Design a protein around this ligand. Structure first.
Ligand code: ENO
Length: 359
C-alpha cells in the first residue's frame, strides 16, 4: 500500500557539465513526491561528469539503496557507465543524455533525450533549404562527438552535403584556437558543433573571433540560456536543434507535449527566473512523467523494493504507449530505447539575445 519507491539519480552538478545537471536536479522540485500512495524517496548524487564516479553511484544505488529505478547522467560518458551497471544489476535505468545503445545496454535502459539522427535530420534539412553545400565539423573527441560526426557523414552526405573538414577537442579544453583556424581556412558554408553546455559556446565564440562568416549549427546539447550568456553576440544567427520544451507557448493546444511543457516552464521559471527553461530540466521532469505512467502498471504485479518490481517496470516501458512529456511523446520498444518521433523536436535560432523558433 504505502511503502516507498526508491529512485537513485546520478547527475552532473560540478565540473564542465554542471550547466546540464544543475537544471536536471533543480527540476526535481517540481515532480511528484509520491505515486499511487507510495512515497518516492529520491537519492541524488553528483558524479562530476566522471564515468568512474557515475559507476560508483549506480552500484551503490542498487546494492545499498535498494533502488527501484536509476536515472542519469547529464552527459554521455557517465550515462554509458550507468547503463552498463543497470544492465548487469537488472534495474530500470532512465538516461538523461543520449548514448549509444548496444546489446549490453538495450534491455534495462531507456533514453529521454532525442536520438541524434532525429536532431541531425532537422539541421541538415535547414542546410539544404538554405543552399548550404559544404559543411565542417568540430566536436568532442568522445562518443557524443562521434555519434554526431557519424550522423553528419551518413545522413548529411546521403542528402548531398559535402564534409570538408573535421576537428575534435576534449571536454575540459579551454582553447580550440587551432581547430578553428583549420576550419576557417577550409571555409565551409556551414559548421556543425558537436558539443554541449559551456563547451558548445567555445567553438561559437572562437569561430566568429577568427573571422568565420558562415552558418553555425549547434546540437541539442547547447539548448539552455548558458549558451547565450557565454557566447553573447557570437550566438546571433545560430541554428540549434532543441526539444519542444523550449517553446510550449507556440505549440498548438492539440499537441500532447503542450500541457506538460507549459506546466514545467511555468513552475521552473517562477522559481529560477524568466527564460530559465532548458532542454535538461525537461529531461528530468519527463523521467518522472514516464514513472507516473509505468509505476501504477508495475504495482499491479509487485511491491516496490523487490526484483519483481524492477522487472514489472521494465515490461511496462514496453506496454505503456504515448507517454506525453514536455520533450516529446514516448513509445519504447525492445529495439527503440529512445521512443521518440518528429513531435520531439524544433529548430531554434538566436535573435537579439533571445531564442526564436525557426519555421
Ligand atoms: O555532452 C554530452 O555528452 C551530451 O550527451 C549532451 C546532451 C545531453 C542531453 C541532450 O538532450 C543532448 C545532449
Amino acid at each position: 500500500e504505502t511503502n516507498e519507491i526508491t529512485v537513485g539519480i546520478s547527475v552532473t552538478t560540478t565540473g564542465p557539465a554542471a550547466a546540464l545537471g544543475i537544471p536536471e536536479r533543480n527540476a526535481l522540485e517540481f515532480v511528484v513526491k509520491e505515486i499511487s500512495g507510495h512515497p518516492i524517496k529520491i537519492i541524488v548524487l553528483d558524479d562530476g561528469g566522471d564515468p568512474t564516479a557515475a559507476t560508483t553511484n549506480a552500484r551503490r544505488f542498487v546494492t545499498e539503496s535498494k533502488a527501484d529505478v536509476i536515472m542519469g547522467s547529464s552527459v554521455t560518458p557517465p550515462s554509458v557507465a550507468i547503463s552498463n551497471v543497470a544492465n548487469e544489476a537488472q534495474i530500470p535505468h532512465i538516461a538523461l543524455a543520449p548514448l549509444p545503445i548496444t546489446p549490453e545496454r538495450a534491455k534495462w535502459s531507456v533514453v529521454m533525450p532525442q536520438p541524434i539522427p532525429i536532431m541531425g535530420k532537422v539541421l541538415y534539412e535547414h542546410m539544404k533549404k538554405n543552399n548550404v553545400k559544404t559543411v565542417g565539423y568540430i566536436g568532442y573527441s568522445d562518443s557524443y562527438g562521434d555519434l554526431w560526426f557519424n550522423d553528419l557523414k551518413k545522413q548529411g552526405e546521403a542528402m548531398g552535403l559535402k564534409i570538408v573538414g573535421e576537428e575534435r577537442f576534449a571536454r575540459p579544453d579551454t582553447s580550440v584556437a587551432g581547430q578553428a583556424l583549420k576550419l576557417v581556412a577550409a571555409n565551409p558554408d556551414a559548421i556543425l558543433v558537436g558539443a554541449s553546455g559551456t563547451a558548445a559556446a567555445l567553438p561559437q565564440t572562437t569561430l566568429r573571433e577568427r573571422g568565420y562568416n558562415g552558418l553555425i549549427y549547434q546540437t541539442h546539447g547547447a539548448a539552455s540560456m548558458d549558451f547565450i550568456r557565454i557566447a553573447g553576440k557570437s550566438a546571433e544567427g545560430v541554428l540549434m536543434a532543441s526539444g519542444p520544451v523550449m517553446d510550449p507557448e507556440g505549440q498548438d493546444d492539440t499537441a500532447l507535449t503542450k500541457k506538460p511543457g507549459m506546466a514545467l516552464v511555468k513552475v521552473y521559471e517562477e522559481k529560477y527566473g524568466p527564460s530559465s527553461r532548458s532542454q535538461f530540466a525537461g529531461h528530468s521532469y519527463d523521467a518522472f512523467k514516464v514513472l507516473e505512467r509505468v509505476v501504477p502498471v508495475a504495482l499491479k504485479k509487485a511491491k516496490p523494493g523487490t526484483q519483481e518490481f524492477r522487472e514489472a517496470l521494465r515490461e511496462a516501458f514496453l506496454t505503456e504507449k504515448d507517454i506525453a512529456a514536455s520533450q516529446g511523446v514516448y513509445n519504447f520498444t525492445e529495439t527503440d530505447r529512445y521512443g521518440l518521433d518528429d513531435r520531439s523536436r524544433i529548430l531554434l535560432t538566436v535573435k537579439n539575445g533571445k531564442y526564436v523558433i525557426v519555421k
